[PDB]
Design a protein around this ligand. Structure first.
Ligand SMILES: CC(C)CCC[C@@H](C)[C@H]1CC[C@H]2[C@@H]3CC=C4C[C@@H](OC(=O)CCC(=O)O)CC[C@]4(C)[C@H]3CC[C@]12C
Ligand SMILES: CC(C)CCC[C@@H](C)[C@H]1CC[C@H]2[C@@H]3CC=C4C[C@@H](OC(=O)CCC(=O)O)CC[C@]4(C)[C@H]3CC[C@]12C
Ligand SMILES: CC(C)CCC[C@@H](C)[C@H]1CC[C@H]2[C@@H]3CC=C4C[C@@H](OC(=O)CCC(=O)O)CC[C@]4(C)[C@H]3CC[C@]12C
Ligand SMILES: OC[C@H]1O[C@@H](O)[C@H](O)[C@@H](O)[C@@H]1O
Length: 476
């Protein structure tokens, strides 16, 4: 209700929007010809051919470096963020994140050198690695109870919205031949300015302030969050978190202990699976894929917007599906849902698309319809729940660190997919989709045997009615 709580919500919404923009803009810019004329002339000549050398037209490690630099940087900067928060506060790290995005935007949009372009992407990666670590800490230490899951779904919606608007910007700036990609990459500056002026107005959480000056500065800070004077009883739980100084000296061992083993294994593998489903094909190289199908320069970027629209609608209804069905059902249904689309796309590509040539109109419509359905399968299952499950399964002692490691490893696997998708496409002509399909199959089995339904179960009830009656979680 107060200004500080709503600022806390706004900073999270904008920080998701910027992350979605950086996911969606790299696909459109890469496929444009203006960008390839100024950074990658080797693959630029290969687009001059009508339909020669399919699947290997864009096989270039530095072209993929343009996409995966941000996520490598985020993986490196995630640990730095995890330390910098606990040393300085949740406000300075957000300020540094805004500064890093603002530096990266000017570097990328006004890039004159390939080294400079990759460095700008790397600075954007620093900013996003800091933000995706400070934002959960704001949301978990300012917003009141019963609003932990409601904020996670809003955050995971903002990324889809950012992807959609990034596709729109790319589609409109693709036609602009003199400086199109520069306009496309300058659009990330607006949410960065908003983040900068939002991170200046927000003050550090009382949990962070009590870590160094207990109630010397955080006592009034907690009163500003909520206008009720009944603070003293709410405080008594914040003190207990940092009471155990000897236990928090080595936070690394608590995750390895059997107390937090069950939610750790679920949390980490969820990041491994949700990235090895193969959605980053569509979020990063969708126009690149559509051009090999045989659509053309505008047709590919125009289909990308359609798939993004599907993503947004499926996410908006996925928030209701999560509230009406259990946490298990959606991940079981999704594996089948995604397996079908990947097999259909792969099977018809293996026969109708060779090393030179183009699919016919019905085949072209099929590969688009089923990829849209593929994305909608992921938007209501692994997208949101891959972050929602670790935000509730970990116990109070290992919630912050347990989620920090999840974000970091997620960034690592994203980097793997983004750096090797086109290399895999060249080496395996149509085996990328079957390679992803095998992962989806093991996802289905892992979900059916090792993830339970945790719908409406409190943290203290996780160890009684979730992992006690489970056949495999015996870590007690
Ligand atoms: C672009 C795509 C992703 C749009 C998704 C819409 C569809 C996939 C439809 C087809 C079946 C629909 C579902 C069929 C039945 C219901 C029950 C329905 O319940 C009621 O209307 C009961 C009254 C109430 O409690 O609100 C709520 C919507 C829901 C989940 C529907 C939600 C939208 C669904 C999934
Ligand atoms: C063929 C294309 C369009 C893709 C098909 C995917 C969806 C249209 C399907 C996949 C699983 C289906 C869901 C499976 C289970 C349910 C639960 C059920 O009702 C509720 O969710 C309300 C609460 C309750 O369970 O009582 C019936 C609708 C719904 C959402 C189904 C609606 C249609 C869904 C989303
Ligand atoms: C668009 C046309 C050409 C075909 C679309 C294919 C799929 C995207 C659709 C149709 C087949 C559907 C599936 C058919 C059967 C089931 C089983 C049904 O029940 C179970 O999965 C078992 C019970 C449980 O797991 O809880 C859940 C919905 C699901 C996965 C459906 C989800 C939506 C799917 C994958
Ligand atoms: O919605 C798609 C996005 O979902 C996120 O959870 C993943 O981290 C991204 O790699 C992915 O592009």
């Amino acid at each position: 209700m107060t200004v500080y709580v709503f600022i806390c919500v706004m900073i999270a919404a904008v920080g998701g929007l910027i992350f979605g923009y950086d996911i969606g803009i790299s696909g459109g810019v890469s496929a444009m010809d203006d960008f390839l004329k100024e950074f990658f002339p080797a693959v630029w000549e290969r687009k001059k051919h009508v339909h020669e050398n399919n699947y290997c037209k864009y096989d270039n490690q530095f072209l993929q470096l343009f996409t995966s630099s941000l996520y490598l940087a985020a993986l490196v900067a995630s640990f730095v963020a995890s330390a910098t928060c606990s040393k300085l506060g949740r406000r300075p790290t957000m300020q540094f994140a805004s500064i890093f995005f603002l530096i990266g935007v000017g570097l990328t949009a006004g890039a004159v050198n390939l080294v400079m372009l990759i460095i700008g992407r790397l600075f954007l990666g620093f900013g996003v690695g800091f933000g995706n670590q400070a934002v959960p800490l704001f949301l978990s230490e300012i917003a009141p109870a019963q609003l932990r899951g409601g904020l996670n779904i809003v955050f995971q919606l903002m990324v889809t919205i950012g992807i959609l608007i990034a596709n729109i910007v790319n589609y409109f700036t693709a036609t602009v031949h003199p400086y199109g990609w520069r306009i496309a990459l300058g659009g990330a500056g607006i949410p960065a300015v908003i983040l900068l002026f939002g991170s200046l107005l927000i003050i550090e959480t009382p949990t962070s302030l009590i870590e160094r000056n207990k109630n010397e500065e955080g006592k009034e800070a907690l009163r500003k969050i909520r206008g009720v004077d009944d603070i003293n009883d709410e405080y008594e739980s914040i003190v207990h978190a940092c009471d155990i100084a000897s236990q928090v000296k080595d936070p690394y061992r608590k995750l390895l202990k059997p107390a937090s083993r069950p939610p750790f294994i679920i949390g980490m593998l969820l990041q491994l699976f949700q990235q090895f489903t193969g959605i980053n094909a569509i979020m990063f190289y969708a126009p690149v894929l559509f051009q090999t199908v045989g659509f053309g320069s505008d047709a590919a970027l125009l289909s990308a917007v359609i798939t993004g629209s599907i993503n947004v609608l499926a996410t908006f209804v996925g928030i209701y599906l999560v509230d009406r069905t259990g946490r298990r059902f959606l991940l079981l249904q999704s594996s089948v849902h995604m397996l079908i689309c990947q097999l259909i796309i792969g099977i018809i590509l293996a026969k109708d698309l060779g090393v030179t040539g183009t699919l016919g109109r019905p085949q072209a419509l099929v590969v688009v319809i089923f990829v849209c359905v593929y994305v909608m399968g992921f938007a209501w299952s692994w997208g949101p729940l891959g972050w929602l499950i670790p935000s509730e399964t970990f116990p109070l002692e290992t919630r912050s660190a347990g989620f920090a490691v999840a974000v970091s490893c997620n960034m690592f696997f994203t980097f793997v997919i983004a750096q090797a998708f086109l290399s895999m496409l060249c080496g395996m002509r149509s085996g990328i989709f079957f390679f992803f399909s095998g992962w989806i199959i093991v996802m289905g089995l892992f979900a059916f045997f090792f993830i339970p339904e945790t719908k409406g179960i409190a943290i203290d009830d996780m160890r009684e009615s979730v992992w006690k009656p489970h056949w495999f979680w015996k870590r007690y």
